[PDB]
Amino acid sequence: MASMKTELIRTISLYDTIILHRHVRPDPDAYGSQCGLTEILRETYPEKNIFAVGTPEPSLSFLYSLDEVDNETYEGALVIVCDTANQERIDDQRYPSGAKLMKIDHHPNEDPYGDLLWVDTSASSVSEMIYELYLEGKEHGWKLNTKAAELIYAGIVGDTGRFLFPNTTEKTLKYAGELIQYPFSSSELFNQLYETKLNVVKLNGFIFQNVSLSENGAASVFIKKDTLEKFGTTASEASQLVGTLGNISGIRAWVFFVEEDDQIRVRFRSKGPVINGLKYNGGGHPLASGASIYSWDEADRILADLETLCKE
Numbered sequence: 001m002a003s004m005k006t007e008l009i010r011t012i013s014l015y016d017t018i019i020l021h022r023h024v025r026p027d028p029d030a031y032g033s034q035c036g037l038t039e040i041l042r043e044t045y046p047e048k049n050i051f052a053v054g055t056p057e058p059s060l061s062f063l064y065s066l067d068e069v070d071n072e073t074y075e076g077a078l079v080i081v082c083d084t085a086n087q088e089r090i091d092d093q094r095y096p097s098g099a100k101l102m103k104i105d106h107h108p109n110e111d112p113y114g115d116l117l118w119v120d121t122s123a124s125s126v127s128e129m130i131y132e133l134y135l136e137g138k139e140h141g142w143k144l145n146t147k148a149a150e151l152i153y154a155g156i157v158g159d160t161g162r163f164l165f166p167n168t169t170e171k172t173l174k175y176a177g178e179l180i181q182y183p184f185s186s187s188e189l190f191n192q193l194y195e196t197k198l199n200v201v202k203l204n205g206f207i208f209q210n211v212s213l214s215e216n217g218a219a220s221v222f223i224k225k226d227t228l229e230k231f232g233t234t235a236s237e238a239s240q241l242v243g244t245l246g247n248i249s250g251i252r253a254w255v256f257f258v259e260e261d262d263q264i265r266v267r268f269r270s271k272g273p274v275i276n277g278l279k280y281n282g283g284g285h286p287l288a289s290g291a292s293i294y295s296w297d298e299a300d301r302i303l304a305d306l307e308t309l310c311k312e
Contacts, residue, residue, distance in 0.1 A: 001118075005118065005136040006136060008104070008133060009133070009136060009142070011102060011116055012041065012078065012080075013140070014078075015076075015078035015100065016049060017049045017050075017051075017073060017077040018048060018049075018050050018051070018078045019050075019051045019069065019073065019078070020034050020035075020052045020080045020081075021054060021081040021084065021090050021091060021092060022034040022082050022084060022091055023084040023089045023090065023091060024054075024055070024090070024091040026054065026056075027158060028063075028154055028158020028159055029083050029126055029127050029155045029156075029158060029159040030082065030126075031057075031063045031154065031155060032063075032151045032153070032154050032155015032159075033083045033125070033126035033129065033130050033155055034052055034082045034083070035063060035064040035151045036127055036130045036131075036148055036152040037080065037082065037104075037133070038050055038052040039145065039151055040130070040134055040144055043143045044137075044142050049073070051067045052066050053067055053091070054066055054091035054092050055092075062192050063150075063151060063154055071094070071097075074097040074098050075097075075098075077098035077099060078098060078100045078102065079096070079102065080102045081101070081102070081104070081105075081114070082104050083125075084103075085105055085109075085111060086110070087113050101116075102115065102116045102118075103119065104126060104129060104130070104133075106120055106122075106125060106126050106128075123171075124156065124159060124160050124167040124168055124169055125155055125172075127151075127152045127154075127155025127156045128156055128172055130152055131178070132171070149179045149182035149184060150189060152175075152179055153176060153179045154189055154193065156172060156179075157176070157189075157193070158193060162190075166287075199231050199232050200231075200237050203233045203237070204241050204244060206227070207244070208244075214310070216311045217253070217310055218253060218254065218306045218310040219253075219254040219255075220256075220303055220306070221245075221254070221255070221256045223238045223258045224259050225259050228258075228259070238256070239256060239258045241256070242254075242267040243269060245269070246269065246271065252270065252272060252310045253268070253271065253273050253275055253306060253309060254268070254269055254270075255267065255269070255302065255303075257293075263292040265290070265292065266282070266290060266291045266292065266293055267289070267290055268289040268291075269287065269288055269289075270287045272287075273309050274287070275306075275309065276289050277309070278302065278305055278309055
């Protein structure tokens with residue numbers, strides 16, 4: 001809604017202090033929406049006290065640095081939470097202690113928190129929504145500088161896997177075209193987003209070398225303790241590699257089994273068949289899913305089922 005968009009801008013003009021949140025374990029969209037908006041507000045309102053809080057992610061610290069804020073700073077503040085569907089995942093829970101709370105998200109509105117809410121499930125990403133907000137804010141004095149343009153672009157390219165994912169729409173590409181006119185270097189941004197440690201690259205090599213495809217295009221990857229120790233890779237590094245099998249000729253759906261301290265992180269992926277239906281105490285989207293498990297026996301039966309989902 002255009003009105004709804006205007007009501008956010010009006011509210012932002014009104015508060016002297018604005019403190020911005022995002023979700024725990026932030027991804028590029030969280031940096032681009034939260035920090036992109038911070039940077040628009042800093043440029044536009046050099047008289048306001050603007051702060052972006054939370055715990056940084058070291059692989060994205062190159063985008064922007066966060067602030068360490070006192071409890072007193074929230075008194076009478078506007079608080080803005082970006083890209084966070086559930087209150088319990090907001091990084092830095094002090095979010096409701098301001099005078100006002102504003103929710104800007106693209107995930108379904110199951111937790112309809114905020115005094116003002118702007119939820120658009122058709123946006124690719126919350127970074128796209130921030131660029132659309134800025135388009136409506138321009139007429140009200142908003143300024144997008146080079147740093148902000150770079151943040152928003154980074155959000156959009158990280159969240160869509162660089163216009164690869166089904167969440168890419170016409171607006172995504174249009175706004176990216178607009179944003180790429182700012183004098184930041186897109187190629188050094190991509191170099192940094194995609195920079196990968198040699199040991200993780202090696203683990204990725206081990207996975208490619210040993211993957212096998214059934215008759216039905218099903219595939220599986222067991223990354224056990226020993227494997228992690230040998231490559232010096234964390235379980236989280238290993239699981240983040242699940243998406244690298246997607247270009248294999250004839251692959252339909254696959255799964256990673258990563259052995260953690262407490263559980264075994266399971267990651268599912270599919271080139272077509274729906275895999276949320278595969279129940280095992282965890283679900284997700286139709287082509288990307290997750291769950292936990294507690295023995296290899298249980299993994300072995302997930303396998304039998306994957307075979308079936310792929311045969312059918």
